[PDB]
Scaffold this active site. Structure first.
Site: not given
Lengths: 249, 250
Positions: B102, B167, B201
């Protein structure tokens, strides 16, 4: 003049270190600035792997790209899981390390297992060599304690390909001592590998007086010209301030 | 209730159980791995700092849950615009053994007017991850971007550059996931037509079963009830797990 001479020499052989649980990018950046002293640069800095990229940038931007970046793996525990030690070492290489100081599985050796230590060092050396990265091996003299065990760990590390043998992690009760340093250097001598294996006392080395004693052992065993950057380093931190003070800075 | 219990189990199985604290240790990560194995199911993954990946992998394997993925973070939490550094950290994460990375998008650079660096940074990291069969999620930090237009732009750039997931946040700034930010980002996925290749996310501040239910409801509304599987949806959270289990009577 003797102490001043040894202090300047020691400064230039320092792996200026910070391996604290509270380390931050800011603190490492400050360490890089410290490595560029008024009387010369340290040989390198030693930090946790995650700080390597920003440290490299900091050293480059201040015009001191020659200050090498060392780091530690399988640290400080020295567990005997080769897969984990190798993964950490490969990660350190990927971050951009110039040198990796890995912890030898000393507890395994104390338990009578010499093979795992040989294989662990060899695996890490193979990875480092392929990336033109030097490998130092920490045997943790303070925990090994016995001269025979210190010699055995040094011997195994050397046979496995260690480019440097280092005394300690700086995380246990006892770290570098003149006695332990002499034993390890005696192994390098007895094995006739002084041209390919360096020595690095680490942990607890805080005064210019201490540094002088460690270099005296090196000069005694291998001659005054042996202890250059490829064969000798001081794993220390506050030592720098002591050396600079002895030099009037 | 019934619906709440159902959404809670679903959210649990989509959780990237996280611990990213300055005082993290191998012991705390081992405890996290144990927590990921619940009496009603396993979380989708754990999310930890890179250095803890090796021991986490071993811990998950020994407890019989090797299917729990290991995600990590890079160029974190700052989102600086130095591509070489972001790439080096990403390659290190891959070397440690990460299943997913990430990475933080260079959001301040975008805010300053640089749309290119974000594209180049994500593309470089995606190239490294794809080459190692590692998925790449991109954190755009919605809380700092603030404006809807900037959130859409960062999402669009990230998607074009190859993001496998977009995200919302790092959890390191004041404002993180919000239902509004989640809707904007999922609308970009929908509008660009990339729902099959890009997941979502929400991360940071997601603490209750009720919250999780709301976030999943947006996904179901926009893409259908069957879209939000592990490859397309994850909850970046921690304390949330205890809330989900409580809702389930556990």
């Amino acid at each position: 003049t003797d102490l001043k001479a040894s202090s300047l020499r020691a400064l230039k052989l320092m792996d200026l270190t910070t391996l604290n649980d509270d380390d931050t990018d800011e603190k490492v950046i400050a360490l890089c600035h410290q490595a560029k002293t008024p009387v010369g640069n340290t040989a390198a800095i030693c930090i946790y792997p995650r700080f390597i990229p920003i440290a490299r940038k900091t050293l480059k931007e201040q015009g001191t790209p020659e200050i090498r970046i060392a780091t530690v793996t399988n640290f400080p525990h020295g567990n005997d899981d080769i897969d984990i030690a190798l993964a950490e070492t490969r990660a350190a290489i990927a971050y951009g390390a110039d040198e990796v100081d890995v912890v030898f599985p000393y507890r395994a050796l104390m338990a009578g297992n010499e093979q795992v230590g040989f294989d662990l060092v060899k695996a890490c050396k193979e990875a480092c060599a392929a990336a033109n990265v030097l490998l130092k091996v920490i045997i943790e003299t303070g925990e090994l304690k016995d001269e025979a065990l210190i010699r055995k760990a040094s011997e195994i590390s050397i046979k496995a390909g260690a480019d440097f043998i280092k005394t300690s992690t700086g995380k246990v009760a006892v770290n570098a001592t003149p006695e332990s340093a002499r034993i390890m250097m005696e192994v390098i001598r007895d094995m006739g590998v002084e041209k390919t294996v360096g020595f690095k006392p680490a942990g607890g080395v805080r005064t210019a007086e201490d540094a002088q004693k460690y270099l005296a052992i090196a000069d005694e065993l291998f001659g005054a010209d042996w202890a250059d950057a490829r064969h000798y380093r001081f794993g220390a931190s506050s030592l720098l301030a002591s050396l600079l003070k002895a030099l009037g800075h």
